[PDB]
Design a protein around this ligand. Sequence first.
Ligand SMILES: Nc1nc2c(ncn2[C@@H]2O[C@H](COP(=O)(O)OP(=O)(O)O)[C@@H](O)[C@H]2O)c(=O)[nH]1
Lengths: 311, 314
Amino acid sequence: PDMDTLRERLLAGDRAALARAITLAESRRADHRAAVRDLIDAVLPQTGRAIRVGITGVPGVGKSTTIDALGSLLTAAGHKVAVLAVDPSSTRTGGSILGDKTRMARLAIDRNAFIRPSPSSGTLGGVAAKTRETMLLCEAAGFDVILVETVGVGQSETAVADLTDFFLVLMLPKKGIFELADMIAVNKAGDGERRASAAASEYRAALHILTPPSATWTPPVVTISGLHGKGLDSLWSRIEDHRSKLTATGEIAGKRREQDVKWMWALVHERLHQRLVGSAEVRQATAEAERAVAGGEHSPAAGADAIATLI
Amino acid sequence: PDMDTLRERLLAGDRAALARAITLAESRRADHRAAVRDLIDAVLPQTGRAIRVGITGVPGVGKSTTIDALGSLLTAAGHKVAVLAVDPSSTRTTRMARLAIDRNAFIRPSPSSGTLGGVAAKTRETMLLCEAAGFDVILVETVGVGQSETAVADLTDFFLVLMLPGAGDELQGIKKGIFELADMIAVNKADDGDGERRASAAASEYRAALHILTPPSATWTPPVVTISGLHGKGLDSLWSRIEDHRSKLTATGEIAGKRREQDVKWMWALVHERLHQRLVGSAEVRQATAEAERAVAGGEHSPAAGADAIATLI
Ligand SMILES: Nc1nc2c(ncn2[C@@H]2O[C@H](COP(=O)(O)OP(=O)(O)O)[C@@H](O)[C@H]2O)c(=O)[nH]1
């Protein structure tokens, strides 16, 4: 596939060129990844002009429909919205070709939206680092809103926070999640407005004893109904407010640089993993070592030196 | 130095054997470190019969004073208490006055290594030595300015946060990342007078907020208590809670369960430490590694481009 032509169509907003480049970046084949490595670098100065928001929520109510509604609001307002899934179980599959795009009915047909399932990789750090490469591609292609969502039942919340500028947690009327939140939004806001309002008050009180990482921002709690689009404009205004404030201080850029280095190393460690499971003997010996350490038969360091010797 | 004897003696609770064994494992070379790995491996079945407690708090909160008092209470009750430090600053290289002369105790500063993972992994190896030598209490402390808390938590069974007595507008607050780790919060400087009053006030604010983030189930809900490390206050009550936790999480099998996940994590951290030693083995490679990482950080090259450059240096 001609890479310069691919780059120009991607830079001109061609959705199929973008998908093609992402597919190359998602690929589990080394020659594919390598090809689109130059393209991403080349296009790097056109990346970053976007709000990156990570979104997670309690098993139950309303994340997909809330994202569909938030998504639909931002497109109708002139934005281009990518929605990327991170799911740790894609370390145990080979990915998804089609994904699951109609869990968000309006965005699934919204020509100004782009939806992509969790990429496959050997490690969760690898899944996430590929997501970062995908985010960069979407941004080069002119997407100014990147929503990254946790999709497993597994533990992807920290990785998604470390992929984004702002972490939104959606709750009903897991301690780790609370202190990742730059905002909490209580879902299903009149008979239940009462309940949401109260719960919001409770969560606001809980948050108080957690010192925010920066003096520039103090996480608020808000109420919404994703079902009926209520509260979303205000919710979004805060995220925008946060963008202006932490951009002025340089803190968004500072967070992004930290994340980028974390992802680089996750990819180095992914490549190490891939070597260790890349043939039968090494793979068997690696599992043997790990198993001995877990079972308390050999010490962490004995396990480690056995693994080091296979490399 | 012969290793057959050393092992026999370490197993007998010979503190000179222990001290020697440790020196070998903190030594920054092979041959030494190899032999003291096989020993650790040999004594593994004598490890683990101990309560492991991670302790953190901001510098000046009174941690070293509190550990001094707590350790001395535990040694007077017939425990053998090792006190180990994890310091991020030892990647670039007697304050407990009573414990320092107490032969029922054993204090070691942070070990040196390339990465934090490696510092923490070394400390696990040191904990196993202490345990095989008869130590039934291991206290691991964060030391210095740094992000050492997750590591200390992942070395121990119970994570204890010491906090300042400030209440209201002077309420300290729990640092990002510590709340998910904390198994108990102890507000220190609860002295006779204003201390006990303000500290209790602080504790009640933490306690009422924690009650929101909480069910009645779960094997363990974190208590909030007050202590005075300096004046000996509330330390017995604190300890009984760590003992209740030990009992509760043993019956459910969750202590053993957590230890298994920790040990694997430390194995991978040593793997990664050995990788880091290779990337810093020569000036040529150290310089190129640093350039690749700066390229990524500067937004000049993408994370994966940075990673490909480092892969090649391997
Ligand atoms: N009033 C009071 N002061 C204390 C207490 N514990 C420690 N201090 C004092 O606080 C200062 C710092 O103590 P230190 O143990 O070095 O704290 P670290 O930096 O957290 O290890 C010293 O001057 C201590 O005497 C306490 O319970 N009450």
